[PDB]
Design an enzyme around this catalytic site. Structure first.
Site, PDB file in Angstrom:
ATOM      1  N   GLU A 168       0.861  -1.183   0.000  1.00 36.40           N
ATOM      2  CA  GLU A 168       0.000   0.000   0.000  1.00 36.40           C
ATOM      3  C   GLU A 168       0.893   1.227   0.000  1.00 36.40           C
ATOM      4  O   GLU A 168       1.438   1.617   1.031  1.00 36.40           O
ATOM      5  CB  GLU A 168      -0.915   0.001   1.224  1.00 36.40           C
ATOM      6  N   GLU A 303      -6.696  -7.844  -0.350  1.00 38.94           N
ATOM      7  CA  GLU A 303      -7.184  -7.815   1.020  1.00 38.94           C
ATOM      8  C   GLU A 303      -8.639  -7.355   1.010  1.00 38.94           C
ATOM      9  O   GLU A 303      -8.982  -6.388   0.317  1.00 38.94           O
ATOM     10  CB  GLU A 303      -6.390  -6.861   1.913  1.00 38.94           C
TER      11      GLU A 303
END
Ligand SMILES: [Cl-]
Ligand SMILES: [Cl-]
Ligand SMILES: [Mg+2]
Ligand SMILES: [Mg+2]
Ligand SMILES: [Mg+2]
Ligand SMILES: [Mg+2]
Length: 379
Positions: A168, A303
């Site tokens: 991320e 995710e």
């Protein structure tokens, strides 16, 4: 009708089209708060609430009907100085042990570079790379050197094993920082980094020339990805997959302030977040389908998930949410990977379905797994 026979033998990711690649990846699970965990500057697998992962866990995941496991790996404290950026061999061996557990259990596996990129606060630093060419060059040099070593260590592995470039990436402001105002430089730098990763993996040759790879957009956000992600150039077709993460609405799925216990059309308005219901799931996944899937570009939800509620009524909504999101993922062409941070399965923010060391299911995990499997494997 482009599909073709799978005249191979061992478990693998496979396919040329987005939907076929998605079938091969099935239902996923993340080994969270594990090799991603770090403490006092060094990756430390047992420092965030889990004992060491085992073959028994991976056998349990396969027996439960999962297809694929994402293995986040933080490398902090295990990488030497420039120019070699040598990875500590014992830590790399540990990553190989966990990959091997997945392989033995007949699962696909994804490995990555994880909290090295957290908040732009360590070496993988988008904020400064976008303003300082010397930093950008150093980040790229480290990314290429690390991925060369990782690729070489796994050169003998078949296409069950996927490499995901990084996790991320954001400048500290989680998508609401200088990326919005800088004219596009940070987005361009991330696209450059993904290209460096692809090139470094492919240069090692062999199986790595045709391995499936994951590449993310900015902060794994669907909107910033569809708007700004650029697919890297590659030496083979159909082996790059766009990685996104999806927790919407996070106030509900992670339950931070312990106030939102219901979700969706039937939720009491006083017990739910003020956005992020069914139309957000399909609306966001429709963007991924229009921009990537329908254009022949595979994508995956690296995710997703929702924490457990001990209250019977609230838990019903959690299972509905997970079933709804998994069915939408299937319908819109993306394999979903549930986020399992492990721990002891107590409290109001537990993601755990399995004990990460014994492989035992915790609490009502069987019922949760069953609804997710119904979304992926049932018409
Ligand atoms: Cl067919
Ligand atoms: Cl919404
Ligand atoms: Mg301390
Ligand atoms: Mg070495
Ligand atoms: Mg810094
Ligand atoms: Mg210079």
């Amino acid at each position: 009708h482009h599909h073709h026979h799978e005249n191979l033998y061992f478990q693998s990711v496979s396919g040329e089209t987005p939907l076929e690649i998605a079938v091969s990846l099935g239902l996923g699970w993340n080994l969270g708060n594990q090799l991603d965990a770090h403490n006092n500057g060094v990756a430390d697998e047992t420092s965030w609430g889990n004992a060491a992962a085992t073959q028994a866990l991976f056998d349990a995941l396969a027996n439960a009907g999962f297809t694929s496991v994402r293995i986040p790996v933080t490398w902090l404290g295990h990488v030497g100085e420039a120019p070699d950026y040598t990875i500590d061999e014992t830590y790399l061996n540990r990553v190989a042990e966990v990959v091997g557990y997945a392989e033995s259990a007949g699962l696909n596996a994804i490995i990555n570079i994880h909290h090295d990129g957290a908040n732009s606060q360590y070496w993988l630093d988008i904020k400064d790379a976008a303003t300082d060419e010397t930093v950008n060059s150093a980040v790229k040099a480290q990314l290429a050197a690390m991925w060369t070593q990782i690729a070489n260590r796994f050169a003998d592995k078949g296409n069950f094993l996927v490499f995901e470039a990084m996790n991320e990436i954001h400048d500290g402001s989680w998508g609401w920082g200088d990326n919005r105002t800088d004219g596009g430089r940070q987005y361009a730098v991330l696209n450059e980094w993904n290209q460096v990763f692809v090139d470094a993996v492919r240069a090692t040759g062999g199986n790595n020339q045709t391995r499936y790879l994951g590449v993310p957009g900015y902060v794994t956000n669907i909107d910033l990805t569809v708007e700004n992600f650029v697919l890297p150039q590659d030496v083979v077709d159909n082996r790059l997959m766009v990685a996104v993460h999806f927790y919407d609405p996070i106030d509900y799925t992670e339950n931070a302030d312990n106030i939102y216990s219901q979700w969706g059309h039937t939720a009491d308005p006083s017990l739910k977040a003020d956005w992020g219901d069914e139309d957000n799931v399909t609306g966001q996944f429709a963007k991924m389908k229009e921009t990537f899937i329908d254009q022949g570009i595979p994508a995956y939800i690296g995710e997703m998930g929702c924490v457990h509620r001990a209250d019977d009524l609230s838990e019903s909504f959690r299972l509905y949410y997970l079933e709804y999101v998994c069915k939408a993922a299937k319908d819109y062409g993306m394999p979903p990977f549930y986020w399992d941070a492990g721990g002891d399965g107590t409290g109001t923010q537990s993601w755990a379905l399995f004990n990460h060391a014994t492989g035992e299911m915790l609490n009502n995990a069987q019922e949760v797994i069953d609804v997710m499997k119904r979304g992926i494997f049932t018409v």
